[PDB]
């Protein structure tokens, strides 16, 4: 299984720098060039540069020459990108992607999970997770909607799954909203009325930047 893995997030102080990593697996690492792309919400995708792992030959986008440095470790099958003297404008999701050549035409066929980088003097804040139980009805429905409130965290992102992922149907996760330098997000899951009261339903939240995990069980009111 071809895979490109990247850490979920990085919180950096303005004027500082970071080394983003991208671990490859499932293929001959040196057999293909590695690409790095930048994605800012609303702006779209931007190409940073490429590197040939076999000899470490690099090619940069003029715009990033002197901001990004690419290297690789053919021993551990890892590719790297250092970003220096970061500014708010550098906040974004960074992707590493495998390149492929077709009749001289280059395209990227496998993309990494992406890394959310946030530039700010603000400090990491783990989320406060609260269970949202209905606690009322009139036997007017066959399905029940439960939820979880993830509030007051920084920075993005957070991962929410239900019953470690066993529950995937009828699940909605709402994009986070920022208010007062802190993000708030919520998630819902709709299960059968015969399921919940008796079967334990739990919400699992992971916040990569703070390395914290919280599991909250939904208990009827």
């Amino acid at each position: 299984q071809v895979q490109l893995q990247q850490p979920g997030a990085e919180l950096v102080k303005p004027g500082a720098s970071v080394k983003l990593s991208c671990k490859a697996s499932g293929y001959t690492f040196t057999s293909y060039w590695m690409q790095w792309v930048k994605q800012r919400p609303g702006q779209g995708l931007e190409w940073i540069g490429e590197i040939d792992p076999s000899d470490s030959y690099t090619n940069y986008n003029q715009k990033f020459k002197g901001k990004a440095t690419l290297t690789v470790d053919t021993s551990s099958s890892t590719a790297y990108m250092q970003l220096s003297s970061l500014t708010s404008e550098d906040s974004a999701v960074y992707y590493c992607a495998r390149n492929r050549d077709y009749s001289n035409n280059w395209y990227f066929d496998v993309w990494g999970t992406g890394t959310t980088v946030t530039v700010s003097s603000a400090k990491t804040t783990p989320p406060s997770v609260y269970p949202l139980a209905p606690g009322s009805a009139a036997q007017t429905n066959s399905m029940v909607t439960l939820g979880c409130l993830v509030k007051g965290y920084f920075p993005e992102p957070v991962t929410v799954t239900w019953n470690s992922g066993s529950l995937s149907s009828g699940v909605h996760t709402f994009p986070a909203v920022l208010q007062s330098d802190l993000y708030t997000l919520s998630s819902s899951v709709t299960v059968p009325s015969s399921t919940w009261p008796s079967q334990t339903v739990t919400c699992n939240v992971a916040h990569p930047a703070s390395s914290t995990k919280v599991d909250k069980k939904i208990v009827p009111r």
């Binding site: 779209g44 995708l45 931007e46 190409w47 090619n59 986008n61 003029q62 715009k63 992707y95 992607a97 492929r100 077709y102 009749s103 001289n104 035409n105 280059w106 395209y107 990227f108 066929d109 993309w111 990494g112 999970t113 992406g114 406060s128 609260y130 269970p131 949202l132 139980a133 209905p134 606690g135 009322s136 909607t145 939820g147 409130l149 509030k151 909605h172 996760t173 709402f174 994009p175 986070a176 909203v177 208010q179 708030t184 997000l185 919520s186 819902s188 709709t190 009111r221």
Partner: protein
């Protein structure tokens, strides 16, 4: 460098219809009868996915309803017939010269039949109350169109400050939207009132949809 321009930026198409996405190159991306135009698809919270390379080559595993055409400076991505899972954002990318560049992207939306929202209201959790704050939450699930608004009424009175609203992107198997409204007050404010109501205004109804609870 060669700039790519995608038109439009947003598109709404009906199920079973044809969606045509345009991409304009500032300069020719041709070379030996080979157009170096690639197309990617990106769904919310996911990395981009390769659809077509070299302008008209369908990557393996990609449904035949997707096709690409063009040469020189004009390219189009065609989806016919469009399906629900096709709700996403599409980007073109050229690999003729350096630097490599992408188009602004085009968000595709599926037009389906109206759907009224399912409303759920949740009072604050005991855990949250111990902390001195109080958040009342309302979920407005699986509706269409996405046009909707929520009003919060406390003891019959409208409240506007401390309300955070968030919509999801179009569903992948439903083509419906969902949204959550969160009303946050201090524990003392919450404890002085008894009736908490959230009423939604959607086109599938002449009168508001009300959902409430009493402390």
């Amino acid at each position: 460098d060669i700039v790519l321009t995608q038109s439009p930026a947003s598109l709404a198409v009906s199920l079973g219809q044809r969606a045509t996405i345009s991409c304009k190159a500032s300069q020719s991306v041709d070379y030996d009868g080979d157009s170096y135009m690639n197309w990617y698809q990106q769904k919310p919270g996911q990395p981009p996915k390769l659809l077509i390379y070299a302008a008209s080559n369908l990557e393996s595993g990609i449904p035949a309803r997707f096709s690409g055409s063009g040469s020189g400076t004009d390219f189009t991505l065609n989806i016919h017939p469009v399906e629900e899972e096709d709700a996403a954002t599409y980007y073109c990318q050229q690999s003729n010269e350096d630097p490599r560049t992408f188009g602004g992207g085009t968000k595709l939306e599926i037009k389906r039949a109206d759907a009224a929202p399912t409303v759920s209201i949740f009072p604050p959790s005991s855990e949250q109350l111990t902390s001195g704050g109080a958040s009342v939450v309302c979920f407005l699930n699986n509706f269409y169109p996405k046009d909707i608004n929520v009003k919060w009424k406390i003891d019959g009175s409208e409240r506007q400050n401390g309300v955070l609203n968030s919509w999801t992107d179009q569903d992948s198997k439903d083509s419906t939207y969902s949204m959550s409204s969160t009303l946050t007050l201090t524990k003392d404010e919450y404890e002085r009132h008894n009736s908490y109501t959230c009423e939604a205004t959607h086109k599938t109804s002449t009168s508001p949809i009300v959902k409430s609870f009493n402390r």
